[PDB]
Amino acid sequence: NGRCATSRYLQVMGSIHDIESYFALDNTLSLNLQIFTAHWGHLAIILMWISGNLYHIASNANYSLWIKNPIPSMPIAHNIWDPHFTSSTSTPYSHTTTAAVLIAYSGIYNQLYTSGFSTVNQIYKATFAFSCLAVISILLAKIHIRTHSEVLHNSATHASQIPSFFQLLYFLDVGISSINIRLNFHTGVLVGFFSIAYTGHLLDVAIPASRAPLSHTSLSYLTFFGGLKSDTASLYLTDIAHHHLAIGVIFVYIGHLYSSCSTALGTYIRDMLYTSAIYMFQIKSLHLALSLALAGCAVLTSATAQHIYSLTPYFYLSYDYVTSVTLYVHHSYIASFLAIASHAHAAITLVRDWVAPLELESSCTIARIHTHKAAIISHLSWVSLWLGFHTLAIYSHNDTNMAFGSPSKQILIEPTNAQLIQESSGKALYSFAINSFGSFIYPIGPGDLYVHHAIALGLHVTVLILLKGALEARGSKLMPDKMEHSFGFSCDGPGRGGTCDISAWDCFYLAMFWMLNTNAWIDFYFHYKYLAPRQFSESSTYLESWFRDYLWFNSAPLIRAYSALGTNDLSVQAWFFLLTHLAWATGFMFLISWRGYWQELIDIILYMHLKTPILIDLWNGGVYTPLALSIVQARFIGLVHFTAGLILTYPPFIISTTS
Amino acid sequence: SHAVKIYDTCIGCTLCVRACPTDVLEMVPATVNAAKQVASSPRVEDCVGCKRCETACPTDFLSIRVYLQENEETQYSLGLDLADWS
Amino acid sequence: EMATLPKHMQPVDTADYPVYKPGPSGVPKLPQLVGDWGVPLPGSYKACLTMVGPDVETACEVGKPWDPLGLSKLYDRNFDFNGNMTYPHVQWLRESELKHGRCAMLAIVGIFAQQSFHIDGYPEAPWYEALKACYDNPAGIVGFGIAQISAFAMVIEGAYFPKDSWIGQMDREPGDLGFDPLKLAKDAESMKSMQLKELKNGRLAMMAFMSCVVGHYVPGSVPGV
Amino acid sequence: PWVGPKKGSWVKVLRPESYWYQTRGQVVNVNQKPEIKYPVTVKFDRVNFSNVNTNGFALWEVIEAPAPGPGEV
Amino acid sequence: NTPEHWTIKASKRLELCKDNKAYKKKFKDELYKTEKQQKKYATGSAVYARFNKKIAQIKNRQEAYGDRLCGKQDGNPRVVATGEWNVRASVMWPASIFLYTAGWIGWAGRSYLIRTNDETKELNIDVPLALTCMASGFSWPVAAWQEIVNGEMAVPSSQIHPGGPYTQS
Amino acid sequence: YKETPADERLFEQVYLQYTSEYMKGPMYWHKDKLQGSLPDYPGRPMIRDGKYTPYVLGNLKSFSSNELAFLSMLFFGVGLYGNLQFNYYDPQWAKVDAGGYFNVSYIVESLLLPISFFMHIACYIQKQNGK
Ligand code: CLA
Ligand code: CLA
Ligand code: CLA
Ligand SMILES: CCCCCCCCCCCCCCCCCC(=O)OC[C@H](CO[C@@H]1O[C@H](CO)[C@H](O)[C@H](O)[C@H]1O)OC(=O)CCCCCCCCCCCCCCCCC
Ligand SMILES: CC1=C(C#C/C(C)=C/C=C/C(C)=C/C=C/C=C(C)/C=C/C=C(C)/C=C/[C@@]23O[C@]2(C)C[C@@H](O)CC3(C)C)C(C)(C)C[C@H](O)C1
Ligand code: SF4
Ligand code: SF4
């Protein structure tokens, strides 16, 4: 199609991986095969990422020196080869005659060290092997493409005599879309047997590497101590091995649940769902499966974010002031993204996958939810309003009283429920000890109570927006016929009072801001309590403490990184602090100023180009005629700028303050 | 191009036709309603997607619907002036 | 005059198909195990009016039950609240009332007789800690005895579960477990008089047991305790 | 004869996409012509988003209901 | 480990304010700041008298708050939210009175709306009826429970708009 | 003769009813009618007349209600005994910490409690089905 504008690129890039929207993707067979191949390529990318990390650790870094003195030493991420740096004098990242290096804040050093890596040769062998695994993944993608092509050819060449041969149309993608066998093998082999295999790895490599004296592998390597070994300040490796052994056994047992290879054994998921409380749903729906997987991944990512910090599993990881914060924040952000992703894909499932029954029929869980979506949304709004009103009001009361200089006048509600739960947990742990757990129990005060209620507000409002989008995706009082329109469309016009941000994609756009806010609140809470436990406990009850003792006070090293006096190793962090501020501010433009103004401006610019003497005779403007970004395109671009600035301006701050 | 559809709830008041900026719509004889006429959309290729017909529709929910199709944008639906795709 | 609307032209009202009932398709809902939850109907207050129990103590008579808070009408109200039978029928309320009356009638005399007498082999403790002591020190005969008591209670409860009484569609009369070994009351008049007497004594025992517990756990709340 | 509801009587709207779905309006008039798909005319005291007070419904989209009470829509 | 410890009074993270060194130090510092600010102005000044009043207010506040619990580390009075009524700085009394007042406001309002049932009355308030409803809203707990029980509070969901259509008609 | 809106609606209703019956029938083939999709697996109807069938119990559909009840009660008793003995009345944590092995009886026994629960729901289902 030669007739095109510059919006062509953005329209394509917004759905490059929306395989269901592809032209000439006739059937679910094509859809599933394309998705499988994309998955293989994704695994190849992950393996190449692992191989690159390992290679750079081996070559550009100091793993061998670090493992000798892990406590004061700092791992190297990779060298800096940037021509723009000053050549007259040494940079802050060099030893005045040495290649510039970057410190590593990913904990991969601790990971390798407690896995059992002793020499750079082992890291090199791993780099090589993971590259080979990437090759294997790509070749498997090719193999499966060929096998599925060979089945289509067969079905074309051979036909059942009876007219029911068309029934085979449904079973061509059975290997990719079968649920019982996939569940059995995933939960039994990919999870349980993988855990058992890692137990074997620990017993064979990690335990001997950690233990100075040689001792034959035996049940003595399996223990149920708890807490952190004093020397490494981490969970006993012997306990990790038992842990994984136990989980592996349990999940290997659970992996015989469904009928996978024969119909003589196992039960059916259709049958469980039919007989259970949830009536039934489109288990075949790829969007629904993606939503469930994303929800599970989000909860697991949050769990690891909390537990890696609480119970240190890696040698000397706790000693690394910066790496702990970086890991927690990283996995918290990933978890938030995965949660909002699950919600967005549930909305998409409702839009284009769910087969709604007739209105009066109420047989499925989704229909039952749609019956009282109004009640759900109203109650969620009530909870959000209560939390916001009271949290903000108590914080403002404390703010005003502190500003007037009377801390005694502050409202300080003791967290009695959380303290009782914590005391019960401590009682259980003390009983176990009589038969250390660091950071699993924390002082907990009224400031913690207020911050927890703020985080609850954030979660409730995010879920409010996402649930409203999902439950109004098919229809709404303002736009009853929303099923016909795509998942994301600009608007419905200025009629009916105006219909800005009326689509389910627009609800996601809105919930993205909240996710970022609630995640920022969580990260600020963790970082403040981590940096200054005592000051946080005493002063975190009013917002001026957050604005002064946390942001303004700890912002000094970052902004002072590079100045008229000189530069230090945080100069890069200071430049990325400002670059990300600028990106956020740019996102404000696409978020505030909308398309008509920019289309008219583009028209004027195009007029100028067409009136320019030399340029007109070469460039007509007919092909890829410039245009202003569409409404949805600009919404997304502004959201991307906002998200990039917000997310990327934090790591510089945390590194500066914790380093 | 966009898709302009008309449903039998139409009462033939002609407000959509009068609000059309590029004359996409026209009233046609019918027996479904008392006015004995229903708006049609023969020239949907000229529809720009302004939803002024939708704004002017009286019925409880619109008897005329404009579905936007950004993938099938043409110069007529984009209102191109400085550049020509013809 | 009205022109008879044909069936195809007849509107299908939404109120005729509540959530608790199968829709126009007519497919039965998922089977329920605790009971066969049939289509509930509003009859709680009428059943309460018909039921025995009110006699001049609160200045009331049969057909005029004592219910200042109207907890018996909440079953009828749940039809307007959700369409989900969240609040129990007066049948379930009477079943629970009779169960509590019998349990408390046993419990009060049990408290007094535990204060007075005792059984060898069982731990010595007050009425407010005897069960906890037995649970904590199962040895000799207390473990077997408490196992017997728990098994008997669970078997009786399972055998005489008030099926569908939550909806009021219970086949048997509330509290009519059939336990009449001596056949003391058989006639309808005698049955009604004895039902009223049992309800009165059970209410008195419930109040006495609550007074005992509250007086013990708040020393000055009740004079006797 | 009168095919639809009586003039002036209250009818509950059963059109799911209607702004007044499941709420009641007053039958302004009914078209007796058999060729009218949506003869009944119902007016409501609550204007919809387009500030429209009345609408036309088919005989199967309206059922007879009592007049709204205090605090009822 | 004991039922006695259920009370917030018997907690290891709190102490009586009159016996809290941090609380005493904070108040002593507030008093010192107020006195230092007062010393700037002349002795017989109206501002001097106002500062004397403020110092008296601070001392009375210290005396009143001495009974309340406060954390050992910071020594700021705490608000008990367990549900214990007979405890200083209990949340139940303010909670109960606010709930009564808020229900009063809501009931009054709902009653005006039910009685009027007209946008014209909503815009131009019928002040007599509004005042009557405001006065009548004092029995809102009993009135609301009675209406809930008798079915005059909530209407069946089939009588109100459910929302947008999620399926084909 | 003129086909009025009422006549068109009548045609629509008759078409809907008849063709819906046809689609339910075996003459219409759709991807949603495969095994594992909406329809029950052949020969194993889980729910009939709004009541669980014996097939919901899988391999226990041939067990009588009486023996199912006995098995559920026995499993409940044994599992509860094992759980209480393991947790409170015969703790094993101290012995294991000393170095001894668990009482293998308690671990295998304790699994019977959830098995007992599901065996009761199966006993009720079988009894409710007249078996
Ligand atoms: C062309 C672009 C493209 C690309 C690059 C990918 C990439 C991916 N897709 Mg795919 N996908 C695509 C298009 C694409 N997809 C399209 C168009 C569709 C149709 C909607 C899908 C539908 C789809 C589904 C349905 C799924 C994927 C998944 C994946 C992953 C593949 C395997 C992998 O490496 O996982 C690496 C992942 C891990 C190492 C993490 C494993 C842990 C999982 C994710 C969570 C398990 C939770 C469990 C169910 C519950 C725990 C309970 C507990 C809390 C108690 C990867 C992120 C899978 C995935 O992981 O989704 C999140 C998946 O389930 N995709
Ligand atoms: C920091 C935030 C930010 C930024 C960067 C801009 C930028 C711009 N706005 Mg503004 N704008 C903002 C916020 C911002 N806006 C907000 C929040 C709103 C909403 C109220 C608006 C609303 C708005 C309107 C309505 C208009 C503008 C206009 C403009 C343009 C001014 C002229 C110009 O481009 O000269 C300066 C350009 C820059 C400073 C951009 C950065 C250039 C850097 C320093 C050099 C680049 C180096 C190198 C080549 C980069 C290569 C990178 C690559 C290799 C990866 C410019 C694109 C006007 C316009 O377009 O006029 C023509 C205009 O009409 N803005
Ligand atoms: C979550 C609860 C649950 C429920 C309600 C059911 C229900 C059912 N399963 Mg079972 N099943 C479960 C879990 C469950 N299963 C699990 C976890 C697995 C994996 C091991 C299986 C694997 C499985 C298969 C392969 C088959 C069934 C079948 C059945 C049916 C007959 C059950 C029977 O006869 O049990 C009574 C039998 C026993 C109690 C003996 C079980 C003994 C083995 C070793 C399993 C016990 C493992 C234990 C719980 C975990 C050990 C953990 C470790 C730490 C020691 C019935 C529908 C059969 C059927 O008809 O399917 C259509 C069938 O073919 N199930
Ligand atoms: C770096 C760390 C910090 C930052 C983290 C990243 C930022 C946060 C993520 C953004 C938040 C939203 C994420 C959701 C994504 C899907 C949304 C979507 O498709 O809707 C985006 C929508 C999709 O498009 C719409 O689709 C609708 C159908 O649903 C209709 O057809 C609409 O008309 C159509 O506009 O809008 C767009 O088309 C957006 C325009 C996209 C333009 C991008 C072109 C430039 C790309 C350069 C960057 C390279 C890209 C590869 C990245 C490499 C990474 C390895
Ligand atoms: C709290 C308190 C006080 C009090 C009090 C009050 C008012 C207490 C009241 C107590 C009350 C009212 C106690 C009734 C008991 C009834 C029993 C045990 C009946 C059993 C009956 C049984 C076990 C069986 C009966 C059968 O008929 C059945 C069912 C069927 C027949 O075939 C067979 C037989 C005949 C066997 C003080 C002292 C005033 C002050 C102080 O502060 C403490
Ligand atoms: S063009 Fe923009 S402002 Fe106008 S209705 Fe659409 S989204 Fe709203
Ligand atoms: S959207 Fe605008 S141009 Fe298109 S038919 Fe409607 S009124 Fe005419």
Side-chain angles (χ1 to χ4, degrees):
Chain A
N1 185 32
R3 311 154 164 93
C4 63
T6 51
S7 289
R8 154 90 77 74
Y9 292 119
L10 307 150
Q11 278 282 322
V12 161
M13 287 308 285
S15 57
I16 40 170
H17 299 165
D18 195 359
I19 298 175
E20 322 210 288
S21 276
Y22 284 3
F23 285 106
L25 191 93
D26 183 45
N27 64 34
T28 43
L29 158 59
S30 298
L31 173 72
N32 294 1
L33 187 45
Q34 278 278 295
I35 293 161
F36 200 41
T37 308
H39 292 185
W40 284 122
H42 192 260
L43 281 169
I45 284 194
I46 287 171
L47 291 146
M48 289 314 310
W49 165 70
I50 292 159
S51 170
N53 288 1
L54 287 170
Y55 160 82
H56 281 269
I57 292 168
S59 180
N60 307 150
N62 61 346
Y63 178 86
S64 76
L65 261 47
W66 178 85
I67 59 175
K68 321 205 305 194
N69 199 6
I71 311 287
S73 317
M74 304 213 267
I76 286 163
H78 56 93
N79 279 341
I80 301 161
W81 201 96
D82 181 355
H84 310 83
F85 266 101
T86 185
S87 155
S88 282
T89 86
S90 58
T91 47
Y93 310 89
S94 301
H95 286 31
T96 67
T97 305
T98 296
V101 299
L102 287 156
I103 298 152
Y105 304 128
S106 58
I108 185 153
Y109 273 61
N110 307 99
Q111 157 64 41
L112 303 176
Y113 192 22
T114 194
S115 163
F117 284 87
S118 293
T119 63
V120 170
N121 218 58
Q122 281 162 351
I123 294 121
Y124 175 73
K125 301 251 184 86
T127 304
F128 216 95
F130 282 112
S131 298
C132 298
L133 283 174
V135 178
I136 285 162
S137 193
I138 291 143
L139 294 172
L140 281 167
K142 159 165 212 154
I143 275 171
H144 286 122
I145 298 162
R146 171 55 185 178
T147 51
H148 283 265
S149 295
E150 249 186 324
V151 174
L152 271 166
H153 182 62
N154 191 256
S155 65
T157 287
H158 303 251
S160 295
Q161 296 262 45
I162 55 177
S164 70
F165 180 43
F166 75 103
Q167 152 164 52
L168 185 46
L169 157 65
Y170 314 129
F171 301 110
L172 291 188
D173 55 305
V174 71
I176 302 170
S177 61
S178 52
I179 310 195
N180 293 332
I181 180 146
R182 194 169 59 199
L183 270 161
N184 250 349
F185 270 95
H186 280 197
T187 190
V189 186
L190 183 64
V191 186
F193 193 70
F194 207 46
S195 324
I196 282 158
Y198 195 63
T199 286
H201 160 81
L202 285 149
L203 300 208
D204 197 8
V205 165
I207 312 304
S210 53
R211 296 184 156 180
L214 313 158
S215 64
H216 205 303
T217 309
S218 150
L219 259 48
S220 312
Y221 284 28
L222 304 168
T223 61
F224 197 168
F225 311 134
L228 311 185
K229 167 177 278 280
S230 51
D231 296 275
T232 44
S234 96
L235 289 154
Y236 282 82
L237 215 44
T238 45
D239 284 330
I240 298 172
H242 182 62
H243 162 91
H244 285 101
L245 177 46
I247 297 200
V249 159
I250 279 162
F251 275 112
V252 162
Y253 259 98
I254 293 167
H256 302 70
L257 199 142
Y258 307 90
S259 75
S260 52
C261 299
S262 79
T263 50
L265 305 164
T267 47
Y268 296 91
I269 197 157
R270 184 225 158 262
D271 277 4
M272 302 169 206
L273 298 172
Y274 189 47
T275 54
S276 87
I278 66 202
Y279 193 66
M280 202 155 47
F281 34 93
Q282 311 245 292
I283 60 183
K284 317 206 76 54
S285 185
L286 279 170
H287 283 284
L288 186 94
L290 184 47
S291 290
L292 274 156
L294 282 158
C297 199
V299 292
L300 292 177
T301 323
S302 92
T304 183
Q306 313 274 339
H307 286 322
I308 277 178
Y309 172 70
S310 295
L311 309 144
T312 313
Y314 298 111
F315 293 165
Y316 311 108
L317 178 51
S318 43
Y319 288 113
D320 194 347
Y321 214 60
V322 184
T323 297
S324 311
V325 181
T326 54
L327 290 173
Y328 180 93
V329 178
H330 167 81
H331 285 124
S332 94
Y333 261 102
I334 297 291
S336 309
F337 267 107
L338 295 166
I340 194 175
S342 73
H343 269 284
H345 280 292
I348 298 161
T349 290
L350 296 175
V351 161
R352 48 163 75 167
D353 270 12
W354 179 47
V355 163
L358 289 200
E359 170 175 17
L360 297 169
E361 280 92 318
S362 63
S363 321
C364 56
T365 296
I366 310 194
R368 286 192 231 96
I369 296 161
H370 277 75
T371 43
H372 69 287
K373 60 187 184 181
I376 300 169
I377 289 153
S378 45
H379 280 68
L380 201 35
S381 152
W382 171 82
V383 181
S384 304
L385 281 168
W386 189 102
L387 280 162
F389 281 140
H390 291 82
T391 325
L392 179 66
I394 297 297
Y395 261 123
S396 303
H397 169 97
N398 299 356
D399 266 345
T400 49
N401 284 116
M402 294 300 293
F404 300 162
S406 36
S408 40
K409 279 168 102 195
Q410 299 184 11
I411 294 162
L412 299 174
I413 314 184
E414 196 72 12
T416 72
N417 300 350
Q419 284 170 356
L420 179 96
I421 293 301
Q422 176 184 88
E423 284 208 301
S424 175
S425 302
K427 267 162 228 301
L429 293 181
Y430 199 70
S431 296
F432 181 48
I434 296 325
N435 249 331
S436 82
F437 314 85
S439 311
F440 201 68
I441 284 168
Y442 43 104
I444 274 189
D448 293 272
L449 179 137
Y450 299 144
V451 179
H452 272 87
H453 283 82
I455 292 160
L457 158 70
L459 294 175
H460 274 84
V461 176
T462 311
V463 175
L464 168 54
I465 304 172
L466 293 163
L467 258 166
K468 209 204 80 61
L471 300 177
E472 311 240 42
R474 280 170 91 79
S476 184
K477 177 130 170 227
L478 189 42
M479 192 180 185
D481 69 323
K482 213 189 294 211
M483 326 174 31
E484 289 79 332
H485 309 256
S486 43
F487 177 51
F489 52 98
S490 35
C491 183
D492 211 31
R496 276 207 315 291
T499 53
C500 326
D501 285 73
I502 196 158
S503 35
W505 189 94
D506 297 323
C507 293
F508 163 82
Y509 151 85
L510 295 171
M512 267 290 303
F513 295 99
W514 272 92
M515 182 229 91
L516 294 164
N517 179 62
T518 189
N519 205 233
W521 286 352
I522 285 159
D523 301 338
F524 283 28
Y525 174 28
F526 170 89
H527 197 211
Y528 193 8
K529 203 167 159 128
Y530 181 89
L531 257 59
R534 194 211 41 51
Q535 173 156 253
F536 169 86
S537 74
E538 307 177 330
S539 279
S540 53
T541 60
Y542 61 114
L543 291 165
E544 183 71 351
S545 50
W546 295 87
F547 195 11
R548 179 228 307 135
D549 297 306
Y550 177 47
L551 294 177
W552 170 84
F553 185 73
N554 299 279
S555 278
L558 188 58
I559 69 193
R560 285 198 228 179
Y562 69 93
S563 49
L565 284 312
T567 72
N568 56 39
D569 61 358
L570 294 174
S571 49
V572 64
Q573 305 296 347
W575 181 82
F576 194 11
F577 189 71
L578 285 182
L579 171 76
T580 54
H581 271 65
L582 179 61
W584 197 71
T586 58
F588 271 46
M589 168 156 49
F590 303 89
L591 291 169
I592 290 164
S593 61
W594 294 1
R595 188 193 180 280
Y597 170 91
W598 293 107
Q599 176 57 89
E600 298 191 316
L601 211 84
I602 287 267
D603 273 341
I604 298 169
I605 296 160
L606 182 54
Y607 166 93
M608 293 286 293
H609 282 64
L610 298 173
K611 279 294 305 206
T612 314
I614 289 142
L615 177 54
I616 178 54
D617 285 296
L618 292 185
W619 186 70
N620 207 63
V623 289
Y624 286 113
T625 170
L627 284 190
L629 320 158
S630 94
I631 297 160
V632 188
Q633 274 156 216
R635 262 175 219 152
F636 174 73
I637 292 156
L639 175 65
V640 163
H641 282 85
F642 196 96
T643 321
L646 191 144
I647 298 179
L648 297 160
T649 182
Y650 198 54
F653 175 64
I654 79 189
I655 289 166
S656 89
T657 60
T658 45
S659 69
Chain B
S1 60
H2 310 303
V4 194
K5 307 268 148 165
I6 289 91
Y7 304 84
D8 61 356
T9 61
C10 173
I11 53 160
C13 70
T14 75
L15 286 174
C16 77
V17 180
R18 301 177 189 279
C20 205
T22 82
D23 177 25
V24 167
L25 276 93
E26 74 191 356
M27 306 307 302
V28 316
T31 89
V32 76
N33 44 53
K36 286 149 137 187
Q37 69 204 57
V38 292
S40 155
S41 82
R43 284 141 263 144
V44 162
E45 309 290 1
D46 307 335
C47 158
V48 292
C50 77
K51 309 177 91 142
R52 277 187 217 178
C53 68
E54 290 195 11
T55 298
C57 188
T59 61
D60 175 357
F61 197 43
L62 284 49
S63 297
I64 187 175
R65 204 67 172 125
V66 178
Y67 310 90
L68 305 160
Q69 288 157 147
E70 309 288 293
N71 320 115
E72 334 184 349
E73 292 260 21
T74 65
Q75 57 152 343
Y76 310 115
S77 75
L78 277 167
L80 284 188
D81 189 298
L82 299 151
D84 181 14
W85 294 353
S86 155
Chain C
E1 54 281 30
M2 291 315 107
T4 69
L5 259 184
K7 285 74 57 165
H8 49 99
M9 300 267 92
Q10 249 152 23
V12 158
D13 196 335
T14 70
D16 270 358
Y17 298 97
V19 290
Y20 58 80
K21 186 185 285 154
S25 166
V27 177
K29 317 201 98 195
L30 190 81
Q32 298 282 354
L33 290 167
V34 192
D36 52 319
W37 286 62
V39 179
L41 301 131
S44 192
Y45 193 64
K46 292 156 73 106
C48 199
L49 298 191
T50 301
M51 259 165 29
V52 74
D55 194 48
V56 309
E57 303 305 281
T58 44
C60 325
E61 200 221 346
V62 286
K64 173 58 188 315
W66 183 62
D67 199 15
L69 265 69
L71 304 184
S72 174
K73 286 192 263 285
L74 282 166
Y75 170 89
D76 302 2
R77 293 296 84 67
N78 64 34
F79 286 87
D80 316 328
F81 290 162
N82 298 348
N84 170 35
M85 308 300 108
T86 301
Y87 299 102
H89 198 253
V90 79
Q91 266 213 308
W92 176 277
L93 296 186
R94 167 54 46 95
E95 180 97 24
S96 155
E97 188 198 45
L98 270 170
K99 207 165 275 187
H100 285 93
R102 296 160 175 171
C103 288
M105 267 188 283
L106 288 180
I108 274 282
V109 55
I111 283 160
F112 294 149
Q114 282 177 221
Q115 306 252 3
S116 325
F117 304 65
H118 195 268
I119 285 167
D120 284 355
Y122 275 89
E124 301 275 320
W127 68 264
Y128 46 90
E129 293 170 357
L131 191 72
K132 189 64 176 195
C134 294
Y135 281 167
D136 287 334
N137 289 337
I141 55 140
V142 67
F144 194 13
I146 192 136
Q148 261 156 105
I149 293 157
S150 316
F152 162 88
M154 146 183 161
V155 158
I156 264 51
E157 294 279 74
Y160 294 112
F161 172 65
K163 190 206 219 204
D164 276 328
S165 98
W166 195 278
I167 309 329
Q169 301 157 12
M170 177 155 65
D171 294 87
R172 63 173 230 270
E173 311 266 350
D176 179 14
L177 270 46
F179 176 61
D180 200 8
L182 308 179
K183 304 180 287 221
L184 294 169
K186 317 196 82 195
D187 155 25
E189 145 59 57
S190 272
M191 258 319 305
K192 213 161 185 223
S193 150
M194 293 277 197
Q195 273 155 278
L196 184 50
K197 280 186 211 233
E198 169 173 75
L199 279 164
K200 299 269 238 303
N201 281 261
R203 293 161 179 161
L204 190 49
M206 275 185 280
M207 285 312 303
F209 174 88
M210 179 204 211
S211 86
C212 277
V213 176
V214 176
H216 172 279
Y217 281 86
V218 195
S221 44
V222 195
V225 188
Chain D
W2 210 255
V3 283
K6 312 293 321 183
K7 276 220 244 166
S9 78
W10 295 81
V11 298
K12 160 159 137 186
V13 170
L14 299 174
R15 190 191 267 182
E17 62 269 14
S18 182
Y19 176 94
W20 307 277
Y21 180 40
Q22 288 191 149
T23 82
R24 289 161 279 186
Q26 290 194 271
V27 166
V28 167
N29 195 314
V30 184
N31 226 316
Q32 316 310 332
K33 270 68 173 294
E35 59 262 7
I36 313 299
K37 227 218 173 158
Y38 306 98
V40 182
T41 316
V42 182
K43 86 190 307 311
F44 320 79
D45 51 344
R46 305 207 324 294
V47 304
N48 65 344
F49 296 119
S50 272
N51 281 75
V52 172
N53 218 57
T54 88
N55 192 40
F57 298 90
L59 299 169
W60 66 84
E61 309 210 293
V62 305
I63 199 171
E64 296 48 19
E72 302 179 37
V73 285
Chain E
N1 41 304
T2 319
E4 309 288 54
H5 279 314
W6 290 339
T7 71
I8 187 136
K9 295 260 195 157
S11 70
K12 306 188 150 263
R13 69 220 59 246
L14 302 168
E15 258 290 319
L16 252 53
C17 280
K18 69 163 68 91
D19 290 292
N20 224 325
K21 300 204 199 268
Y23 169 80
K24 180 203 177 190
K25 173 175 181 180
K26 275 180 163 60
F27 256 109
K28 189 195 294 97
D29 294 351
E30 169 152 33
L31 265 160
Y32 163 98
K33 278 161 70 198
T34 300
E35 279 218 329
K36 202 215 78 78
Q37 203 55 30
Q38 153 163 287
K39 282 189 226 111
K40 313 183 113 177
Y41 314 94
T43 303
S45 323
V47 64
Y48 202 96
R50 303 220 278 291
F51 268 107
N52 280 333
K53 257 201 80 194
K54 170 52 139 162
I55 288 169
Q57 268 164 23
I58 293 160
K59 295 191 205 229
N60 309 30
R61 202 200 309 146
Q62 182 164 2
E63 196 81 339
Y65 290 5
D67 299 358
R68 284 151 71 141
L69 301 147
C70 35
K72 284 179 183 96
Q73 312 290 9
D74 45 306
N76 284 347
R78 301 285 214 273
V79 177
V80 180
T82 58
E84 300 162 45
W85 290 79
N86 303 355
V87 76
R88 270 293 291 270
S90 193
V91 82
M92 296 302 276
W93 301 103
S96 66
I97 65 185
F98 170 90
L99 282 179
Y100 185 66
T101 302
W104 190 322
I105 302 167
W107 204 240
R110 181 179 180 274
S111 57
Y112 179 81
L113 284 182
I114 279 152
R115 306 255 186 292
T116 46
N117 222 60
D118 185 30
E119 57 243 60
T120 71
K121 298 251 194 177
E122 209 158 330
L123 187 68
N124 283 277
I125 301 298
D126 180 1
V127 176
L129 182 72
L131 266 51
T132 284
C133 305
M134 291 211 291
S136 313
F138 88 96
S139 65
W140 80 258
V142 184
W145 182 247
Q146 262 173 344
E147 270 183 342
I148 285 167
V149 165
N150 294 292
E152 312 138 28
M153 168 80 84
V155 296
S157 306
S158 44
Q159 296 194 25
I160 53 174
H161 205 295
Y166 53 89
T167 170
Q168 174 181 13
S169 96
Chain F
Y1 169 79
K2 273 174 81 195
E3 153 157 73
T4 59
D7 300 341
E8 340 179 315
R9 184 142 162 90
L10 171 53
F11 184 94
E12 291 183 5
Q13 253 57 54
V14 58
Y15 176 94
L16 259 61
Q17 158 166 47
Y18 159 84
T19 201
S20 302
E21 184 88 329
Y22 202 77
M23 311 216 188
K24 260 175 264 229
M27 282 305 218
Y28 178 68
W29 282 31
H30 194 71
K31 79 163 174 23
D32 285 18
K33 289 224 285 160
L34 304 158
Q35 308 183 176
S37 294
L38 302 170
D40 287 326
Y41 288 85
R44 282 188 274 99
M46 311 286 268
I47 292 166
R48 272 223 191 291
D49 289 345
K51 186 182 299 320
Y52 282 138
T53 53
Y55 293 106
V56 174
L57 319 185
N59 259 291
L60 302 163
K61 66 193 183 302
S62 298
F63 285 61
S64 72
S65 40
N66 267 13
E67 60 207 319
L68 276 165
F70 154 65
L71 257 52
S72 63
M73 202 46 98
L74 175 83
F75 286 178
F76 173 83
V78 176
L80 189 70
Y81 167 92
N83 271 275
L84 295 162
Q85 214 67 263
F86 181 91
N87 287 296
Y88 311 108
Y89 310 132
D90 192 15
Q92 311 282 298
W93 306 118
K95 180 183 63 159
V96 158
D97 273 338
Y101 300 108
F102 281 114
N103 203 272
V104 173
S105 292
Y106 296 166
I107 308 95
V108 304
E109 281 169 13
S110 298
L111 276 312
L112 302 177
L113 201 70
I115 297 164
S116 82
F117 167 76
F118 290 117
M119 199 83 80
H120 104 248
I121 281 150
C123 159
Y124 174 75
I125 279 155
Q126 213 72 341
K127 172 173 47 97
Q128 154 186 280
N129 265 256
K131 256 195 68 57

